[PDB]
Design a protein around this ligand. Structure first.
Ligand SMILES: CCCCCCCCCCCCCCCCCC(=O)OC[C@H](COP(=O)([O-])OCC[N+](C)(C)C)OC(=O)CCCCCCCCCCCCCCCCC
Ligand SMILES: [Fe+3]
Ligand SMILES: [Zn+2]
Lengths: 30, 258, 122, 85, 48, 244, 231, 210
């Protein structure tokens, strides 16, 4: 009732957040 | 699972932030803007404890506004934006007839009730104010019919014609002009064209009702199908061994095709 | 002095490549190419601008010698277009571009022939 | 070079084709002559005339157009106005 | 007054200068461009 | 004949690779005045006939092809001088021509939505799509070699390499060809801006993928004259590093 | 101006906030924002030209009041009406009626000349399909059905333009007269009985408008909402 | 006897859809063009760049194509329609070329309006009619089917009749009027965001119901 049922979209969102975190870490460490 | 719940919570936070930003922008507008609200417009309206009675096959457009004592028969059509409010009196619209878009079929007094017969067309933006139109007549686009006018069976009022009070349009006759002079005799081919137009517009009304009575899911599905089938490649289809036939959802009925 | 359109209507006929007889209706002052496009035997997207520069002989129509005497003769640009845009670089002596055929009641009743269509996409 | 047959050549060929019928006579044949009345022929004679004309000119005549070839002038006009002749 | 139009304008400005200037240059370049475009005959044999 | 993406790729990508190959096989390996003479004759022919044939063309793709031939002729003058400045000019010209060709073919693909075929098709474009008309006119003027735009930088530096080259004949032929071949670019600009055709061909809007690339390329072309030092230094370093 | 600059900035901020909201909705899997709903508003404003409508004045939901309309008390605007006052204002008095499918609009652009604001008085019927275009109508008047009134038309008190009449620019309809015809011309003088009929019609039509507003103010049908939503 | 349907929508919680695609025919609106939220474009409607479709009007090209050209203005509450074939045997699709101003209560059906035209309100153009280039029809003019309005002329009357020829200065003002209503349409356009906020209202309604 309060959960996203799309596994592919959830994996895409996880990958996008991981990408943002990795880019931020790369910028900070560079 | 837990990932879905976490993503839902993140989406809820993002949605709340977006709504807050939207409210801040609306406040910064200065209060001039009029926020868009729900429809508030009702197609069928019950007034004076007196409800419209429309058939199950009549196509009444959502933009059309029918109020009160309108009684519409089988296979009829009331197109977009047409107004038929029988509140001070009654409006009786027969079967197989059509009242085209942006038109008005109002009734007055409390006695000159509005009567429209069968297999009769009332064209675009036509105004009726208590007429008695018999079966298989033809009122053109923009024609305005005043109080107490009677149009006989197989009679034509041309486009943009004022027909005054108590005027009678005789059968097999055409009336045109601002004081509505006699024009012609409306020959047999013209009468056959009138009947064919009534039938064709009934079929068009059926198609329009079928398209307009679709919920969100059907609209989205047909939009996806139309977007995917909008353009086709035959070289790659032949290479793959596929045909890509048009789905029946986008197949328009042959009744409305030339 | 009612100023209708039936006076401007010019009715002519066209036999297309496979030999089917067609009836073509076009207004006076509007070109034979426009009349054929409205009829539907010429691809509208193939020829859009009614100009000699934009014409690549996709409006070419073969006309009878007894009808060539009723319309102005071919211009140098028209002859050049016909010569260049052809299977063989020769002049057909019976064909004229549909852009330069200005329809009129003098040409009303004219019979034309539509040759095999050519590709135009890229 | 050239897509339509010359009008004079078409007229001469059509006249010669008509002359090659046993029932007709060269005296009563004219460029404007009705097959049924002027030449004194029948329905089958007209049909055979149309078929002979189309065989000579090497292209098939549609049914309605052939039905409208009841005169030598009509035949000449149709043959001269057709690109497949 | 005659020199203003018969010689200076018609014979020189609209005459020799223009004939040997933009007019003749335009005509010669048009015909030369046409002749050059005639080379691209669309034949594989011609290209080879 | 080939589809428009195919011809765009053919016009853009192979030029730089083949010319770098030519530099590495001829300028380094078989460097000798006869090769520069061969390429001098080829450049003369390329410029002259490209201008002459593009003046007579009435199709956008064919005009682009002949413009590419002429600009290859200019790259060939840069090669046929075959010095440090000559090779640097060759590289500058290749970069500028690639940028301008990307711009022009992006605009062509933008107009491909409505199936543009002839030069007249883009007529009256200054009314329906104003900013597109100015962008394409800027591209055409860059192809011409008008100073404020990027094409003129490669142009005058090629001509300077030709003046230090000793090839006065080559430079004169190149500049006369530059004047001659301006006419069809000017005709394009006239078709967009000056003409008032009876009927107009309305063009559908672009995609963001082409729009961003076109905006970046047009900004680079228009504002290159404000800062050409990076490209000039890079090309000079490349020319110097060809040998040592 | 600074007001318009702030309006544009507010539009940018609202667009960004709505984009964030739609991003959150897509994260939640809620795609109902893609549902195309009618954006029609009964009262639509320009930058700083919001329409004014007094309370106890009926405005149909299908009616659209764009711009600088200034509806007064106890008046009516019916279904399908369009009231456009963006170029110049529309002033509408008290007790008047704008019947179904009517149009009261002000001229666009100044090409023809100065843009005349539209003025409609009190206790006046403004026709049943009329197309008023920047004219002035006085109190207790009866603009007829499907009547065209061009800019500069001045209808005086207790004056009637019959149905279908096309009153051209700079035409004055005087007291107690009826004008009709496509080249609008005088037909017959009015009578005190007809003037009393005009006033009584205005009053009873305002009463009918009050009844319509009372019936329309009812809460939206949850049954109908569920019927539309589910299949 | 008529049988009312119990499952009939008396309230759609959303007005008439602005775009009504019939079968595979999807109405097309240029991004530069402005169509008001109150309009109804059904079927084979094609509105090009710069068009100014004003509130309250309807364009039903289900029977045949309807085309609105560049900078063309169609004003409030007008009706546009088409049908198969015409009395003139010419194509019966409704075509309105560029720089054509069309008044409020114009009733257009199977018209062929050539570019740079002015048409007043309450003007009716029945099937097969064409108004040639650079022509003006004043308010209330009705043209019979198959009647044409010649180029460079002004026409008037319930039966269309020629009034006077048009001077060049008056002719040049038609594109100026077209672009003036185009500018007003652009002013109207800025008040609409790409996405409506009504979905928040429908979600609130759903939460209130459950
Ligand atoms: C984050 C990456 C991603 O795709 O997230 C899924 C979500 C939702 O994807 P979706 O598959 O639900 O929707 C596709 C359509 N869009 C993305 C346009 C809504 O995508 C985004 O949020 C991408 C846009 C914002 C990027 C920052
Ligand atoms: Fe042509
Ligand atoms: Zn009424």
């Amino acid at each position: 009732e309060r959960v996203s049922t799309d596994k592919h979209r959830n994996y895409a969102v996880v990958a996008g957040t991981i990408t943002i975190l990795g880019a931020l870490g790369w910028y900070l460490k560079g | 699972g837990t990932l879905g719940r976490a993503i839902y919570s993140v989406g809820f936070w993002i949605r709340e932030t977006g709504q807050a930003i939207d409210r801040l922008g609306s406040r910064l507008q200065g209060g001039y803007f009029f926020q868009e609200q729900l429809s508030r417009h009702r197609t069928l309206m019950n007034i004076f404890d007196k409800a419209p009675v429309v058939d199950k096959d009549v196509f009444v457009a959502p933009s059309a506004s029918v109020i009160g004592d309108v009684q519409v028969g089988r296979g009829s059509s009331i197109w977009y934006g047409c107004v038929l409010r029988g509140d001070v009196n009654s409006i009786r619209v027969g079967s197989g007839t059509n009242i085209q878009d942006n038109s008005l079929v109002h009734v007055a007094k409390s006695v000159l009730p509005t009567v429209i017969g069968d297999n009769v067309t009332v064209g675009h933006s036509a105004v009726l104010h208590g007429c008695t139109v018999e079966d298989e007549a033809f009122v053109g686009m923009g024609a305005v019919l005043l109080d107490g006018v009677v149009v006989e069976k197989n009679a034509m009022v041309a486009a943009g014609a004022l027909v005054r009070q108590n005027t009678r349009i005789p059968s097999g006759e055409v009336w045109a002009g601002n004081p509505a002079k006699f024009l012609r005799k409306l020959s047999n081919e013209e009468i056959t064209f009138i009947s064919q137009s009534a039938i064709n517009y009934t079929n068009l009304a059926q198609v329009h009702a079928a398209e307009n009575s679709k919920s969100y899911d059907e609209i989205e599905f047909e939009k996806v199908l139309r977007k995917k089938y909008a353009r086709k490649d035959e070289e790659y289809d032949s290479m793959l061994g596929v045909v890509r036939e048009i789905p029946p959802e986008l197949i328009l009925p042959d009744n409305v095709l030339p | 002095s009612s100023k209708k359109v039936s006076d401007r209507i010019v009715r002519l006929s066209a036999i297309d490549f496979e030999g089917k007889k067609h009836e073509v209706v076009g207004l006076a002052g509007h070109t034979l190419l426009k009349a054929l496009i409205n009829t539907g035997l010429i691809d509208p997207d193939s020829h859009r601008l009614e100009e000699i520069d934009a014409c690549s002989a996709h409006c070419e129509v073969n006309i009878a010698q007894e009808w060539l005497d009723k319309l102005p003769p071919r211009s140098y640009d028209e002859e050049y277009v016909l010569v260049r845009n052809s299977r063989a670089r020769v002049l057909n002596k019976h064909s004229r571009l549909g852009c330069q055929v200005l329809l009129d009641h003098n040409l009303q009743g004219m019979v034309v022939a539509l040759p095999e269509p050519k590709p135009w996409d890229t | 070079r050239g897509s339509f047959l010359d009008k004079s050549e078409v007229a001469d060929r059509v006249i010669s084709c008509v002359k090659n019928f046993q029932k007709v006579d060269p005296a009563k044949v004219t460029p404007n002559a009705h097959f049924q009345n002027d030449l004194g022929l029948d329905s089958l004679d007209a049909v055979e005339i149309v078929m002979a004309l189309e065989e000579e000119f090497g292209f098939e005549i549609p049914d309605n157009e052939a039905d409208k070839i009841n005169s030598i002038k009509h035949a000449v006009d149709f043959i001269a106005s057709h690109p497949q002749a | 007054l005659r020199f203003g139009y018969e010689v200076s304008f018609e014979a020189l400005d609209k005459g020799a200068i223009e004939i040997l200037g933009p007019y003749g240059i335009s005509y010669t370049f048009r015909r030369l461009a046409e002749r050059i475009s005639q080379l691209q005959s669309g034949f594989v044999y011609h290209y080879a | 004949g080939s589809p428009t993406p195919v011809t765009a790729f053919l016009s853009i990508a192979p030029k730089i690779s083949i010319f770098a190959n030519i530099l590495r096989v001829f300028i380094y390996g078989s460097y000798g005045a006869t090769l520069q003479q061969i390429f001098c004759f080829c450049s003369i022919a390329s410029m002259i006939l490209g201008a002459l044939a593009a003046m007579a063309q009435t199709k956008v793709k064919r005009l682009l092809a002949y413009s590419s031939i002429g600009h290859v002729g200019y790259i060939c003058i840069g090669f046929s001088c075959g010095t440090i400045e000559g090779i640097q000019s060759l590289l500058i010209g290749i970069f500028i021509y690639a940028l301008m060709t990307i711009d022009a073919f992006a605009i062509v693909l933008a107009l491909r939505q409505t199936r543009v075929k002839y030069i007249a098709d883009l007529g009256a474009l200054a009314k329906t799509n104003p900013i597109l008309a100015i962008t394409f006119s800027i591209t055409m003027f860059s192809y011409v070699g008008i100073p404020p735009l990027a094409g003129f930088c490669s142009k005058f530096y090629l001509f300077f390499a030709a003046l230090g080259c000793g090839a006065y004949f080559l430079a004169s032929v190149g500049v006369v060809t530059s004047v001659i071949g301006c006419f069809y670019y000017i005709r394009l600009v006239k078709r967009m801006f000056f003409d008032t055709p009876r009927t107009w061909i309305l063009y559908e809007p672009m995609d963001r993928d082409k729009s961003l690339l076109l905006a970046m390329t047009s900004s680079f072309i228009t504002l290159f004259f404000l800062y050409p030092s990076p490209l000039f230094s890079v090309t000079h370093q490349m020319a110097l590093s060809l040998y040592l | 101006t600074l007001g318009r600059a702030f309006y544009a900035v507010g539009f940018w901020i609202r667009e960004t906030g709505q984009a964030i909201d739609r991003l959150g909705s897509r994260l939640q899997g809620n795609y109902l924002f893609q549902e195309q709903l009618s954006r029609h508003r009964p009262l639509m404003n320009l930058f700083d030209k919001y329409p004014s409508v007094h309370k106890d004045a009926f405005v149909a939901p299908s009616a659209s009041l764009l711009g600088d309309v200034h509806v007064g008390p106890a008046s009516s605007i019916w279904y399908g009406c369009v009231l456009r006052g963006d170029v110049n204002g529309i002033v509408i008095g008290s007790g008047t009626n704008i019947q179904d499918n009517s149009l009261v609009h002000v001229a666009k652009s100044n090409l023809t000349g100065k843009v005349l604001p539209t003025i409609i008085g009190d206790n006046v019927t403004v026709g049943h399909s009329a197309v008023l275009q920047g004219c002035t109508v006085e109190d207790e008047a009866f603009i007829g059905m499907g009547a065209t009134l061009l800019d500069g038309v001045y209808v005086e008190k207790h004056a009637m333009v019959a149905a279908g009449a096309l009153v051209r620019q700079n035409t004055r309809i005087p007291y107690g007269e009826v004008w009709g015809g496509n080249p609008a011309k005088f037909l017959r003088k009015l009578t005190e009985d007809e003037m009393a009929f005009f006033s009584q019609s205005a009053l009873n039509y305002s009463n009918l408008a009050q009844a319509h507003a009372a019936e329309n103010a009812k809460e939206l049908e949850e049954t109908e909402f569920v019927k539309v939503l589910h299949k | 006897s008529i049988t009312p349907s119990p499952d009939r929508v008396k309230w759609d919680y959303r007005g008439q859809r602005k775009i009504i695609p019939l079968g595979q025919w999807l109405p097309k609106v240029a991004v530069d063009a402005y169509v008001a939220p109150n309009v109804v474009l059904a079927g084979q409607v094609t509105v090009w760049d710069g068009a100014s479709v004003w509130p309250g009007c309807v364009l039903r090209g289900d029977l045949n194509k309807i085309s609105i050209g560049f900078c063309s203005n169609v004003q409030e509450r007008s009706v546009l329609h088409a049908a198969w074939t015409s009395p003139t045997g010419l194509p019966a699709d409704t075509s309105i070329e560029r720089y054509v101003t069309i008044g409020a209560y114009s009733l257009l059906r199977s018209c062929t309006i050539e570019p740079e035209c002015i048409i007043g309100q309450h003007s009716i153009l029945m099937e097969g009619s064409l108004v040639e280039t650079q022509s003006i029809l004043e308010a209330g003019s009705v043209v019979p089917p198959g009647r044409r309005i010649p180029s460079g002329e002004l026409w008037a009357g319930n039966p269309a009749r020629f009034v006077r020829t048009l001077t060049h200065e008056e002719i040049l003002e038609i594109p100026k009027l077209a672009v003036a209503i185009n500018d007003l349409s652009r002013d109207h356009y800025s008040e609409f965001l790409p996405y409506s906020t009504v979905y928040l209202e429908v979600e609130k309604f759903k939460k209130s119901l459950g």
